[PDB]
Amino acid sequence: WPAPNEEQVTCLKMYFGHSSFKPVQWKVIHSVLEERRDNVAVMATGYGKSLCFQYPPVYVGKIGLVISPLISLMEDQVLQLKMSNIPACFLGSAQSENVLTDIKLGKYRIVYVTPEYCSGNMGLLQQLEADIGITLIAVDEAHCFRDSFRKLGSLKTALPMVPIVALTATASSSIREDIVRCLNLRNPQITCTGFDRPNLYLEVRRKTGNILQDLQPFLVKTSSHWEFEGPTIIYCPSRKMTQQVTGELRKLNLSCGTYHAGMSFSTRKDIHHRFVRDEIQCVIATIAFGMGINKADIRQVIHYGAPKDMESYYQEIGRAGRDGLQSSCHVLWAPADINLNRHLLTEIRNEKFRLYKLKMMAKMEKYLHSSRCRRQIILSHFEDKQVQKASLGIMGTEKCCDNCRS
Ligand SMILES: Nc1ncnc2c1ncn2[C@@H]1O[C@H](COP(=O)(O)OP(=O)(O)OP(O)(O)=S)[C@@H](O)[C@H]1O
Ligand SMILES: *CC(=O)Nc1nn(Cc2ccc(F)cc2)c2ccccc12
Ligand SMILES: [Zn+2]
């Protein structure tokens, strides 16, 4: 494996602020830049998946195409890029003609587009590659599904020289093969970023049948006022449970924001941004709240109800402690929550992924009932080459998990 040169490291520091590339980030970046190779990267939350597709077009001064149906989330990525002096935009049906002319003139490094727009404008994409050059096409599977990827199968046929970086939130081997055939990838480099988040203390406790009684141990009294220790996310299995929990917390005059897909994108965006600006201390959310939170100091994550499955749990708690400081992740559960989760696993159309999720769910109930190290149970899914000294140094201590405490 080759090392990045001074031009490469200086570009990383100037436009991204990082002094070094993480091992898997450099494997993906180098393979796209030098070998023009398709990549499939199994991405664990918190690693740094964005640099894999944002950095290459910035370094070569060309276009990087980012595909996702989530337009609602593209503004924050575009706005963040423009703040780091990286020209970026959203390209769509409702975009002005002057933005499209500026894309054709090579004024934008990162162009965010939907799968739907791609399908209807393949000729524009071919013109863009011939005249300007497309460094890469990035596709996040977590942002979508096979029906949305069916429109993207013509990408490798129309742009054979443009490498595709497909990012996925699951280690499922059948999903990996589905994304390879859906996008017609050619000899893709397969990488994975599974890692321990050692600054996350883990704890599981049983629900008492009373919301305030369950959440009271997490609250501190600052002079006379009840509040959380720091920025907190409470995950609920339903929109109705987010409303119940919020209503109870507001009886204590706690600074809250509810977040779920029943609220408009405008109301949701408002809650998210109030959390980032620290105007609200707690966000009570369904799993709809998670992607691109852009909050480094989440101190506490509470799953108010058993998590759907072990893999989902691993990904959701990864939104805590992005600053590297001490954070806590608590699960509050009852055996009746498990009965409910089981029924929702039959509503998976891929029987190969449904069985994968069923093994992940069986691991979840074992994890919840266990007397063993929580971190050891989660890390038992990774190869030893990914478990480092920092993780071993934390396991067996008070800062690891409830079962490692005395
Ligand atoms: N080379 C790097 N050096 C240091 N930190 C990095 C590096 N690459 C990424 N990170 C950090 O890794 C964290 C996660 O970044 P990403 O995974 O790209 O975030 P994201 O794409 O917004 O994903 P979500 O939606 O928040 S999971 C951030 O704190 C990054 O700044
Ligand atoms: C190589 C690699 O990172 N593998 C990987 N395996 N999983 C599955 C998993 C399930 C539950 C859990 F607690 C941890 C891991 C994942 C998930 C996410 C990213 C990578 C991987
Ligand atoms: Zn432990």
Counts for the chain of helices (H) and strands (E), in that order: 18, 15
Q: Which CATH architecture has domain 200-404?
A: 3-Layer(aba) Sandwich (3.40)
Residue whose CB lies within 8 A of the most ligand 1 atoms, among 51, 78, 110, for a mutation test: 51
Per-domain residue ranges for the chain?
6-192, 200-404
Contacts of 63 (CB under 8 A, 6+ apart): 57, 103, 106, 108, 109, 110, 111, 128, 132, 133, 134, 135
The string of DSSP letters for 155-196 reads HHHH-TTS-EEEEES---HHHHHHHHHHTT-SSPEEEE----
Which residues contact ligand 2 via a Cβ below 6 A?
Answer: 42, 44, 171, 192-194, 310-311, 314, 378, 381-382
Of 188, 174, 162, whose CA–CA distance to 28 is shortest? 188
Is residue 401 annotated as involved in ligand binding? yes
For residues 5 and 405, give the distance between their C-alpha atoms in angstroms, rounded to a whole number: 46
For residues 340 and 237, give the distance between their C-alpha atoms in angstroms, rounded to a whole number: 10
Question: Residue 302's beta-bridge partner residues?
Answer: 234, 330
What would the two tokens of residue 217 be?
A: 């141990």
For residues 394 and 201, give the distance between their C-alpha atoms in angstroms, rounded to a whole number: 9
For residues 239 and 313, give the distance between their C-alpha atoms in angstroms, rounded to a whole number: 18
| Same-fold call for 6-192 versus 200-404 | yes
Helix H or strand E segment including 378 = helix 374-379
Residue type, 111: V
Residue whose CB lies within 8 A of the most ligand 2 atoms, among 192, 200, 383, for a mutation test: 192
- Helix residue ranges per DSSP H, 207-350: 211-215, 239-250, 265-276, 310-317, 335-344
Surrounding ion ligand 3 within 5 Å at CB are 373, 375, 400-401, 404
User: How far separated are the first and last CA of the chain, in Å rounded?
Assistant: 45
The string of DSSP letters for 32-93 reads HHTT---EEEE--TTS--HHHHHHHHHHHTSEEEEE-S-GGGHHHHHHHHHHTT--EEE--T
Helix H or strand E segment including 392 = helix 389-394
- Placement of tokens 């520091």 in the chain: 13
Buried-state track 155-188, b at ≥16 Cβ within 10 A, e below 16: bbeebeebbbbbbbbbbbeebbebbbebbebeeb
Determined by X-ray
Angle formed at CA 37 by CA 176 and CA 105, multiple of 5 degrees: 115
Q: Are 41 and 167 in contact (CB under 8 A)?
A: yes
The CATH H-level superfamily of 6-192 is P-loop containing nucleotide triphosphate hydrolases (3.40.50.300)
For residues 367 and 363, give the distance between their C-alpha atoms in angstroms, rounded to a whole number: 6
Contacts of 158 (CB under 8 A, 6+ apart): 122, 125, 126
For residues 63 and 11, give the distance between their C-alpha atoms in angstroms, rounded to a whole number: 16
3-class secondary structure per residue, 325-349:
CCEEEEEEECHHHHHHHHHHHHHCC
Is residue 46 annotated as involved in ligand binding? yes
CA 218 to chain centre: 26
Indicate the angle between helix axes 351-369 and 335-344, nearest 10 degrees: 170
Question: Residue 64's beta-bridge partner residues?
Answer: 110, 136
What would the two tokens of residue 90 be?
A: 């959203």
The string of DSSP letters for 201-221 reads EEEEEE--S-HHHHHGGGEEE
Instruction: Tell me 4's DSSP state.
Output: P
